Each structure stands twice: as structure tokens, then as C-alpha cells.
Amino acid sequence: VNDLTRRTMTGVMTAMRQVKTMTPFYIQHMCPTELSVLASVTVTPPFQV
Amino acid sequence: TASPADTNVVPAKDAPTTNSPPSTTSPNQAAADANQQQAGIVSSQSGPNAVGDSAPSTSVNNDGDIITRPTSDSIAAVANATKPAAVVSDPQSM
Incomplete structure (x- = not known):
């Protein structure tokens, strides 16, 4: 990894870190609501440990 | 929208042993492999999880024996x- 590659990798990684995404918000605040609702309509109830 | 096929999913009849191939060598391992391959999993992606597992098979009796025909027939065979x-013919019969 010469210097040019080193910066390139760094730029790519920080690009991945910086891009906005709603996925974490959906998981923490929205997904549990959907799971709770769906858990009551299937014939087979959820089996968990 | 409200597709029943996605809501009424339950295990099919004869589920625990349906995929078992007919063999006598290592029925439980063979059945386990058949289940794994049937489910769409490929060995190269399951990795070490595929080596030791075993599953129930039709070739195995409830008593834990290797059977090649339904147990009733085995009972019928010995019977x-x-x-x-019932009636025999011998000269001295009165």
C-alpha cells in the first residue's frame, strides 16, 4: 500500500461512513412495530430464545 | 395482497423424514444431507456445519434398527x- 493507495482506501472508507442512510433509524424506531403486528397474524406464532 | 400462502405456512405431512433417501449404509447422515441439499443450501456455504449432523430417516426403525420394509410386513413375515x-392325514386317527 503506497501513499496513493492509502489515501484512496481512506477516502472510500470515510465515504461509506458519511453517506446518509435511514436503515438504523428504521430498525430502532419502526421495525419493532411491524414485527409486533406481524407476530399476531401468522398461523405459527414466533418461537424465540 | 393478503396472500394466504404467506400466512398459513405450516409443516407438511411426513415432514420430519420425507427427504430421506432409501439406503441402509448411514441413513441418518444421508437423510441430513438430503435435507440440507433440498433446502437450497450448498455445502461450500454451510462449511463445517455439514460434517457431523444427522436427521431421522424412514430406513430406521423406532426401536433403532435398519429396516427395508414397513414393520407390519416384518411382523407378517415372521408370522x-x-x-x-390344521388338518393332517395319518392312518391312526380314530
């Missing part, structure tokens, strides 16, 4: 092997 003639 038929012993059927003395």
Missing part, C-alpha cells in the same frame, strides 16, 4: 413362517 397344517 407366515410358522403355520402348521
Whole structure:
């Protein structure tokens, strides 16, 4: 990894870190609501440990 | 929208042993492999998880024996092997 590659990798990684995404918000605040609702309509109830 | 096929999913009849191939060598391992391959998993992606597992098979009796035909037939076979003639013909019979 010469210097040019080193910066390139760094730029790519920080690009991945910086891009906005709603996925974490959906998981923490929205997904549990959907799971709770769906858990009551299937014939087979959820089996968990 | 409200597709029943996605809501009424339950195990099919004869589920625990349906995929078992007919063999006598290692029925439980063979059945386990058949289930794994049937489910769409490929060995190269399951990795070490595929080596030791075993699953129930039709070739295995409830008592834990290797069977090649339904157990009733086995009962029938031994029963038929012993059927003395009901009426015999001998000179001294009164």
C-alpha cells in the first residue's frame, strides 16, 4: 500500500461512513412495530430464545 | 395482497423424514444431507456445519434398527413362517 493507495482506501472508507442512510433509524424506531403486528397474524406464532 | 400462502405456512405431512433417501449404509447422515441439499443450501456455504449432523430417516426403525420394509410386513413375515397344517392325514386317527 503506497501513499496513493492509502489515501484512496481512506477516502472510500470515510465515504461509506458519511453517506446518509435511514436503515438504523428504521430498525430502532419502526421495525419493532411491524414485527409486533406481524407476530399476531401468522398461523405459527414466533418461537424465540 | 393478503396472500394466504404467506400466512398459513405450516409443516407438511411426513415432514420430519420425507427427504430421506432409501439406503441402509448411514441413513441418518444421508437423510441430513438430503435435507440440507433440498433446502437450497450448498455445502461450500454451510462449511463445517455439514460434517457431523444427522436427521431421522424412514430406513430406521423406532426401536433403532435398519429396516427395508414397513414393520407390519416384518411382523407378517415372521408370522407366515410358522403355520402348521390344521388338518393332517395319518392312518391312526380314530
